[PDB]
Design a protein around this ligand. Structure first.
Ligand SMILES: CCCCNS(=O)(=O)c1ccccc1
Ligand SMILES: CCCCNS(=O)(=O)c1ccccc1
Ligand SMILES: CCCCNS(=O)(=O)c1ccccc1
Lengths: 119, 119
């Protein structure tokens, strides 16, 4: 949703978006809420984000973020900002994979809400 | 094991853990191996998982799973996530009891790696 997201990402994620929303019972409404900063800790959205990340190998089976793959997918414009916020927010911590991603999202959104995006 | 697993279960299983590891020649390394995502189809671990399940009355003599009790014993957030996964992955199928549980474990891990834990 933020204006920096490369156009190609909308097509790149389309397959795994459909699959992940089906698996987690996610609605588009929940997703639209996130750029508005209305994220709540509900598995239907938190496990969706986990699902989408895992699909691009941005996280492992334990929801640990691969910083290199994350920076790789991000555009050049955001490398500086994203590296700083990852330093701050990683490694992930939480009770389960979905909570780990919720905790990461909240962490990022505290200083850099426009760096965390969901589609 | 994942961070969500109830503290109580470490003590609750200690008796049957010992008996089940002894029965199936299981080593602690094999058990630890699973958390890492490295579950293999080997009877010393797959029959161990059967054995622990049966101890909690979660499987019968044919490795049919009691979905209701399995789900009921999971903490709230894991119970929600597992309902879907268990809908897909149950009832069990396979050539023997040990393979049935291997197939269940892999099935669960495809969508919900952190849901299927072994101790
Ligand atoms: C780092 C930005 C947060 C990623 N959130 S997301 O899980 O919806 C997602 C969006 C796009 C690709 C993969 C995952
Ligand atoms: C007695 C209370 C502990 C059971 N909780 S459990 O999540 O570890 C669990 C173990 C085995 C199957 C399902 C859930
Ligand atoms: C979601 C259920 C996981 C079952 N895994 S287990 O069979 O090794 C087991 C762990 C603890 C108690 C009984 C069985």
């Amino acid at each position: 949703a933020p204006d920096w997201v490369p156009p190609e990402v909308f097509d790149l994620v389309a397959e795994d978006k459909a699959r992940c929303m089906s698996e987690h019972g996610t609605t588009q409404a929940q997703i639209d809420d996130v750029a508005k900063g209305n994220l709540v800790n509900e598995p239907s959205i938190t496990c969706y984000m986990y699902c989408l990340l895992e699909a691009f190998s941005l996280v492992d089976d334990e929801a640990n973020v691969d910083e290199d793959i994350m920076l790789g997918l991000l555009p050049d414009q955001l490398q500086e900002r994203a590296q700083s916020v990852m330093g701050k927010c990683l490694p992930t911590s939480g009770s389960d994979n979905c909570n780990k991603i919720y905790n990461l999202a909240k962490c990022v959104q505290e200083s850099a809400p426009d760096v965390w995006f969901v589609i």
